[PDB]
Design a binder for this molecule. Structure first.
Ligand code: WBK
Ligand code: WBK
Lengths: 305, 305
């Protein structure tokens, strides 16, 4: 019983975090086999960062401009190259702790674990969702650049995020591990705005199912509705419209609880229209949208109450 | 910027988790040097669990009754002994991944990271606070027994919790690593009730300071109050009374934000008396009490807005 924001165990990723220094700029890198991946803006000075031309800045660097440290052990850089917004530093040693891994790009609405790091040293782990506007609501201070987000499936680490920057609103933007940004952002020190965000409906419903599985039932009702009638209310409260494929993804939770998806939509309708009236769901006083259906199944009991 | 429930990186603990089987009972153990620690109720059958006499049950076991696996590698048990509610199994191999560590008992109101494990395999990490009634609001399924809670200070792991059981209310109880229970519980399959819980006031105030540091200011006001006048309101809302030592612990946050503790108490007074009126603080619609002053300092920027 219970329901917590739960990260993947971070050990397989801790063994890959290194510190990358170029000049007076220091951030984190990800060491896999004999390659270190880090944000390319490590090559920029403070003046370069306002309007960098990265092709020019990189051509002016040599391998000896990059100090890579795995603890106190220095790693000798033997080659450098750029892939989109990621710098790739070839080192002379393959990381003996390299896990099985993939580089995958995630979709808005999906979650991942973040290993927050400073000066190559892991400091904390937490869960994040990719917002519909391609930002994440992380917890990052100066020096966290190069921290990575990941999922773990059967001892294979799927890396999906490298952290690059914080926007003026305090939310965070970065790239996949191929260096392509999530969302309409660029790695320059200029004020950039994300698009308007929306609430991830399928995740809210998954979380309501988690609540029922755990025995929180006060918000249920006997009403059912239709896909089209619900999506009218979703638009009114800035929720994403619900698709039949989302209903199917929610199938296992619907089957375990015996509550049809369109039945649960009626309960969400009333929660949106009336609030909670002082009560809580799984210890929260608002509707939580950063748990996927997979996150609920992964964490919750397989047998309902 | 940002504020998340943040766990310690789990790697140093992942390297210590093993599976302990006795008969048909399987749970998790903690392998440090040449000793495996696990809940003693691994020696009980289903009938034994209703009213066990552990001294009798252990005397009837030999080393060969205990199967210990670190992955697929079986570990040979060469001695067994009981310390309170913890079983200690001596193995023939010292764990090569043993970190620097301490066994410390924590106080109600303090936090720690939990590495949730099943069949010796870590599955998730999350933060927990020890409630004033000596329970934790964890996320645990059958088979999680033996999972541990810990803090990390300078590569030293301070183990403070081993998980033993879930109460009828869905909250969780366990022991320190010396096998002494937190709270008035015993390791028998009988319905046991925790004492009435209260809200951890100093933690709520720390979290309000985190909010200000991050630029959430709507709840502040110009009023100040006295320690005695606030503790009158705390009693009314089932908060713990505030002590001068708590004010001193909050000193660094008070100094960074420039908001005196008794000033912040006035704001908490009004939040308790009026609710939030639809607004949120750090993404929550209720007052959060599972972040210590240390957790806030550790995670938040050292410079206020
Ligand atoms: C909650 N509400 C109420 C209030 C919200 C609070 C809002 C206050 N937020 C800020 O001030 C963050 C601040 C905003 C900002 C952005 C652009 C601009 F023109 C002026 C200001 N952004 C940076 O300073 C960036 C600057 C930067 C640099 C390089 C590139 Cl390639 C890109 C960028 Cl953009 N710096 C980093 O992102 C560093 N790499 C890492 C870093 C540094 C400092 C702080 C956090 C982080 C992180 N993570
Ligand atoms: C949220 N609200 C709305 C509803 C709240 C939901 C409440 C429903 N909760 C329960 O039913 C949990 C259930 C309560 C219960 C407790 C005692 C009793 F007499 C009858 C029932 N307790 C157990 O079954 C215990 C039994 C047990 C065994 C050994 C010892 Cl040494 C001690 C104990 Cl106590 N079993 C374990 O704790 C296992 N070790 C581990 C385990 C098993 C199963 C499930 C979770 C866990 C964990 N973690």
């Amino acid at each position: 019983s219970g329901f917590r924001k739960m990260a993947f165990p971070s050990g397989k990723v801790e063994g890959c975090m290194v510190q990358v220094t170029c000049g007076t700029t220091t951030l984190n890198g990800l060491w896999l086999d004999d390659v270190v991946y880090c944000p390319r803006h490590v090559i920029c000075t403070s003046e370069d960062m306002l309007n960098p031309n990265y092709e020019d800045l990189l051509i002016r660097k040599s391998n000896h401009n990059f100090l890579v440290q795995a603890g106190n052990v220095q790693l000798r850089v033997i080659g450098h190259s750029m892939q989109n917004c990621v710098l790739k530093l070839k080192v002379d040693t393959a990381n003996p702790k390299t896990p099985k891994y993939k580089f995958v790009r995630i979709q808005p609405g999906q979650t991942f674990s973040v290993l927050a790091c400073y000066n190559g040293s892991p400091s904390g782990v937490y869960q994040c969702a990719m917002r519909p506007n391609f930002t994440i609501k992380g917890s990052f201070l100066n020096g966290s650049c190069g921290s990575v987000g990941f999922n773990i499936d059967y001892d294979c680490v799927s890396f999906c995020y490298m952290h690059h920057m914080e926007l003026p609103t305090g939310v965070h933007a970065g790239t996949d591990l191929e260096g392509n940004f999530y969302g309409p952002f660029v790695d320059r020190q200029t004020a950039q705005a994300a698009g308007t965000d929306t609430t991830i409906t399928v995740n809210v419903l998954a979380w309501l199912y988690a609540a029922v599985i755990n025995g929180d039932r006060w918000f249920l009702n006997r009403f059912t509705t239709t896909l089209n009638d619900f999506n009218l209310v979703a638009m009114k409260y800035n929720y994403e419209p619900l698709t039949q494929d989302h209903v199917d993804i929610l199938g296992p939770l619907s089957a375990q609880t015996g509550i049809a998806v369109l039945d649960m939509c009626a309960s969400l309708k009333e929660l949106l229209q009336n609030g909670m009236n002082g009560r809580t769901i799984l210890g929260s006083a608002l509707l939580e949208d950063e748990f996927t259906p997979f996150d609920v199944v992964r964490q919750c009991s397989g047998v309902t109450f």
